[PDB]
Amino acid sequence: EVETFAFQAEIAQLMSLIINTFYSNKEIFLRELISNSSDALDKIRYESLTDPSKLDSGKELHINLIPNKQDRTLTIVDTGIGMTKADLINNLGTIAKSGTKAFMEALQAGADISMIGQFGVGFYSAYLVAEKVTVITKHNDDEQYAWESSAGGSFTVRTDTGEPMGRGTKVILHLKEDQTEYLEERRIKEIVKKHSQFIGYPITLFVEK
Ligand SMILES: O=C1NC(=O)[C@@H]2CC=CC[C@H]12
Known part of the structure; x- marks a missing residue:
């Protein structure tokens, strides 16, 4: 059972702008997703201060970066x-x-x-x-x-x-086919140190096989 929904017109417009606009500084995507992860980790940590049972589904608060060249996924x-x-x-x-x-x-x-x-x-x-x-x-x-x-x-x-x-x-x-540089370890390390060096959670960069 797969449910299909339409984006709001404004959100679809934002997605088309990001996709179509010529903009070379693409590496900031990682900073944004890492920052999204840090915000979600802050939320569960604060909620657990008044309710320890919220960590029953996992005490560890961390961020993992996993590249996979075979599937071409990050x-x-x-x-x-x-x-x-x-x-x-x-x-x-x-x-x-x-x-x-x-x-x-x-x-x-x-x-x-x-x-x-x-x-x-x-x-x-x-x-x-x-x-x-x-x-x-x-x-x-x-x-x-x-x-x-x-x-x-x-x-x-x-x-x-x-x-x-x-x-x-x-x-x-x-x-995308021309964006495989973000599967390489040295590229991800360089980006993390450049834009996310002070994140208050351990960031573990997995390496490939
Ligand atoms: O993580 C996400 N953030 C978003 O805005 C997008 C839509 C809602 C949930 C899944 C995606």
Whole structure:
């Protein structure tokens, strides 16, 4: 059972802008996704200060970067608070609507794509380097879901049958053919040290086989 939804017109417009605009500084996608992971990890850590049982699905708070040249995927895994089904369909899209509008206005005033995170829609910077994005997520109050979109105006949501995560979010970047440099270890290290050197959680860069 796969459910297909339409993006809001404004969100689809943002995705087309990111995909079509000529912009060479693509490497900032990693900074945005790492920052999204750090924000979700902050949330579950704060919630556990008043409720230790919220960590029953995993005490570790960390971020993993997993490149896979065989599948041509780059995966950003965090053990943060995760996302409910309403998040995937309604809540994050409500927030992204006003953030997109502010992002569009700033761009016409001289801002560039690298400041996308200041408007709360940094996730969509993933489409600078990815033709398809899959998001596996598990919230303490909901089931494990798989979100997916190759842009084009629609996204799908399904109950995930893969390996259970416990809690957190898994963002799988199906990279474009000419963006395979972000599967190389030295490139990922250089980007992490350049834009994410002070993240308050351990970032483990997996290496390939
Ligand atoms: O992680 C994510 N952030 C988003 O804005 C996008 C839509 C909602 C949930 C899945 C994606």
